[PDB]
Every structure is written in C-alpha cells, then in structure tokens.
Design a protein around this ligand. Structure first.
Ligand SMILES: O=C(O)CCCC[C@H](S)CCS
Length: 362
C-alpha cells in the first residue's frame, strides 16, 4: 500500500491500520470513540496526506478552474477557497474538491485520494484551450487537519501569524513549527479547525510539535474511523459512498455549489437535470445499535424508495445514523425500513439535516 510521510509516526503510536484508497492508514490509535470525543471537546489531529493537490499556473488559471467546476471561482478574491464538484458532460459527479485562489495566475486544487489519477487526467485533458500549465504536486505534499473547539487556541502558539484573522474557508501562507505552510480554516468535522498543507519532508516535525501540544489539553491524534464518524454527524459527503458519476449535484443536496449562470462542463446536462430532480439524500436515525452499510435497501411501507449510502454509529447523538439516496417523495418525519442481510428490516426515521453542528465557523 502507499504510505504517507507520517506512516512511521502512526506505527509508533500503535495505531490499528486499514487500507483506504490504496493507502496504509490509521483506523484509530486508542479508540474511535475516544478520538471522536477529542474532536468534539478539545482537538483531534488527522493525517490527510493521502489527499491530492494540483497546481494550475498561468494567466487563465481562473477561467480554467471556473470552466471545470460547478461553483463560481471567477469572483473569489485572493486568499479564499471554495468547495465544489467537478462534473462530466452528462452532469455526473467526477469528484468533490476544494480550490484555493492563490492569485490570478495560481490556483491549488485539493481532491480525494481515490480520484487523484482520474481527476488529474480529466483536468489535463481539458487544459488545451487555456493559457495554463497543470501539475500534480501530491507526491511531495502533506496535509494535516487540526480540528476541534480548542483547535485555534492550541495551534496559535506555533503559528507565526494570527489565526483569528483567517476567516472560514480563507487561507494564508505562514510558518508553523518553523516551516512554511499554507494554513486554511477548513475541515471535515463540523467543528472549528484548520488544515496545514506542507512539503512532505516537513510533516514529521510539524506533527511531533503538534502532538506535544495535544497531550497538554487532552487532545488526540485521530484516525479514519473518527474521521468518518465526525463527517457523517456533520452530514458531509464522501465521494464513492454518497455520490459518484451516477449522481448529479442536485440529487445529493449540493445544489448550492452549482452556479448555472456561468458556463462549465456539464452545464447543459445539469440545466435539464435541475428540472427533474427525482432523488434526494436524506439523513436517517435507525433504531438499535446495528450500523447500516452502503447498498442496504431502504423501504417505505414495504415499497423500496432507495438505498443506504453511508452508515455509522454517532457517539455524539448516541444513535446509529445513515445517509440514504431515496425518491423525492420521502420527507422528514417519515418512518422507513432498512433491509439488513437476511432480509431483516430495521426501523429508521428521516430527520432534518445535518445531524449535528459544532463550533465550525461561518
Ligand atoms: O475506513 C473506514 O472505516 C472509513 C473511514 C474513511 C475516512 C474518511 S470518512 C474519508 C476520507 S476523505
């Protein structure tokens, strides 16, 4: 499996490993529960160096990105990032991503680990009519997520610049633990937090420095188990599970990242799709302790309406929770049935999204 520059640190910490998107990653160090509460009460640090980073440089960096993504990148000022999806000609979701507007001539794209190759090829195969050069800097770039209500107060003593000045989804170049870093107020937890992008060679040092500060405030390094629990509670999507090229943005609740007033790949397809949204992604709270898995059929009074996309147990709400792609007719308050292996039906209630909102800003 592929190993991030912090693999050795995870091994030393005695973490239980799991294969994620071809990477040997830490599922948890102590327990998924302990790590989730760390994110919810103080701070949890995640190694997300498996994520990819693409750099677009050139006079038409802005128009190129705007042509590729569904969201409005043309308006974004320097130092701002934006969440979005990148669609194919038929409006299917190729991947969701975050794009940083460094300057008129430079943009950085952060994409999912499993889609690095696919995304990069897609992006390169579309640079032809744009005065830009696209490069993949994933191989030498690390990314650390420092999340929690006490994330800012704990991280600040190692950062050369003021963090309070950095707004939600804003970023800046600074120095952390003596090394250059692109610090952003972003996250996948629903709490306040930051992500630290840095040269891979510097990952171990920054990580060690941060670990030292965590043991002081009862914080903890957190694995993928805790990462999934927190994002699901926050009701954030995971490409490959909650959506893929067979779903358009409107079907999974991402209408807000699609700006149809501009031209972009999949635009025409989406105009027609928007007129007939027959599916929606709903939040479910199941009875019992059994956890739903992707693919389990979802029923309404004995009739199928969809299927589970993501499932896990939320210690924050103390319930088995799930996301499910179902027919438009499903509404909040509905009583549904999730079919577990062996045809065993488990009751589930449709609830207003998101399940939980923490200290995350703006
Ligand atoms: O391995 C697991 O059990 C799932 C955790 C997946 C981690 C997060 S939810 C995805 C990274 S974008």
């Amino acid at each position: 499996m592929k190993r991030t520059p912090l693999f050795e640190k995870h091994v030393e910490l005695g973490a239980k490993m799991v294969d994620f998107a071809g990477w040997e990653m830490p599922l948890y160090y102590t327990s998924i529960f302990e790590e989730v509460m760390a994110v919810r009460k103080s701070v949890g640090m995640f190694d997300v160096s498996h994520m990819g980073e693409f750099l677009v440089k050139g006079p038409e960096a802005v128009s190129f990105i705007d042509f590729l993504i569904t969201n409005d990148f043309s308006s974004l000022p320097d130092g701002k990032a934006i969440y979005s999806v990148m669609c194919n000609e038929n409006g299917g979701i190729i991947d969701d991503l975050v794009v940083y507007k460094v300057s008129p001539d430079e943009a950085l794209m952060v994409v999912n680990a499993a889609n690095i190759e696919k995304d990069f090829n897609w992006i390169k195969s579309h640079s032809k009519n744009f005065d830009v050069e696209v490069s993949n800097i994933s191989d030498t770039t690390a990314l650390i997520a420092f999340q929690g209500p006490k994330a800012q107060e704990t991280l600040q003593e190692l950062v050369e610049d003021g963090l309070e000045e950095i707004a939600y989804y804003s970023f800046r170049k600074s120095i952390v633990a003596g090394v250059e870093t692109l610090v952003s107020r972003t996250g996948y937890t629903g709490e306040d937090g930051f992500e630290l992008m840095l040269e891979a060679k510097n990952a171990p040092k920054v990580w060690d420095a941060l670990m030292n500060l965590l043991r002081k405030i009862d914080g903890r390094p957190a694995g993928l188990g805790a990462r999934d629990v927190c994002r699901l509670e926050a009701t954030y999507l995971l490409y490959g599970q909650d959506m893929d090229e067979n779903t358009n943005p409107f079907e999974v609740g991402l209408s807000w990242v699609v700006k149809l007033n501009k031209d972009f790949v999949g635009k025409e397809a989406l105009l027609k799709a928007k007129e007939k949204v027959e599916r929606k992604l709903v939040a479910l709270e199941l009875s019992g302790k059994r956890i739903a898995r992707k693919g389990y059929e979802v029923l309404k009074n004995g009739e199928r309406v969809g299927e589970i996309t993501s499932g896990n147990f939320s210690p924050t709400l103390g319930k088995s929770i799930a996301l499910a792609l179902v027919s438009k007719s499903v509404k909040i308050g509905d009583q549904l049935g999730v079919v577990f292996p062996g045809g065993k039906l488990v009751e589930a209630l449709v609830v207003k999204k998101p399940f939980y909102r923490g200290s995350v800003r703006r």
